[PDB]
Structure 1
């Protein structure tokens, strides 16, 4: 720690809505003119920042999961959410938003109504009668007898390759 990512540096600095899309294990801002138009094959992270009368900022973090998003995208959205909350000193309330089941609050961020569209960025992932036990045991042993040891092994010698730490 800390995360030094450029988008973290921008996150929650002033009141407003910020949206990022998970793209190949990164958090990439969504162009503001496309806010509200969600690819159902993707996952997003949304930060709503609100000015409190006490001068502080209030934070709600929503991670939105499209029906067709890949496991790397949904997992990354969840992790980025934790990381952003921690960066914001734990003050953000976290919300999981699933396509078709979003909270009233999330839906309310989008005054023209959020819309879905198919597609998205590609995943970042790169009988025989009574049991005759003696017969079974003989078979198993025959199978075992025929097993040959691997000859290609790097042997473990307990060699230490790194530097031994000494307290000062």
Structure 2
């Protein structure tokens, strides 16, 4: 499909992404800054080291209301990125209620925690019209 987190790498700084729709989904403005407990967020940091090999680090965050199934899919994509960057990157997955200074240090503005997505805005794309039978 369109894996941006795994294919991420076009700017030395920080990129935030979120899993949604059985694929990778970015977090538009206004939305960024709020972590969800019913989903997984994948973040990849990129900097320019002396040699200029562009350092690549990534943190895998999961929600407490996401059994190993949802957390498994998120960790799965994170594990692949590692094999691709099993050179010396910084891979570290964080959980809700157990974050670390790295996270609290990456965002000190005060990350908001949203819970319960009261919204039935979601439809399944059907295969063209039912003309076929």
Q: Which TM-score band (shorter chain)?
A: 0.7 to 0.9
Root mean square deviation of aligned Cα = 8.3
Classify 1:121/1:18 alpha carbon distance in 2 versus 1 (closer, same or farther; 3 Å).
farther
Contact 1:39/1:116 (CA < 8 Å) preserved in 2? Answer: yes
Higher helix share: 1
Please give the secondary structure, in 2, of the residue aligned with 1:32.
coil
Taking a change above 3 Å as real, the CA distance of residues 118 and 15 of structure 1, as seen in their structure-2 partners, is same
2:77 paired residue number: 80
Contact 1:48 1:59 in 2 (8 A): yes
SS at match of 2:73: helix
Worse-superposed segment, 37-46 or 105-114: 105-114
State which drifts further: 67-76 or 86-95: 86-95
Q: Cα distance, 1:51 vs. partner?
A: 2.1
Report SS of the residue matched to 2:94: strand
The whole-number CA distance in structure 2 between the counterparts of 1:33 and 1:152 is 25
The 1:28/1:153 distance shift into structure 2, 3 A limit, reads: closer
- Distance change >3 Å, CA 61–CA 124, structure 1 → 2: farther
CA offsets, 1:4-59, max 9 Å, x none?
73415751322122122122431211124422210111111111112223212222
Q: Give 5+ residue unaligned stretches, structure 2.
A: none
Does the CA-based 8 Å contact 2:12-2:45 persist in structure 1? yes
2:130 paired with 1:154: no
Whether the aligned pair in 1 keeps the contact of 2:5 and 2:24 (CA below 8 Å) is no
CA 1:68–1:87 in structure 2 vs 1: closer, same or farther (change >3 Å)?
same
Shift in CA distance, 118/13, structure 1 to aligned 2, threshold 3 Å: same
Instruction: Indicate if the aligned counterparts of 1:24 and 1:122 stay in contact, CA closer than 8 A.
Output: no
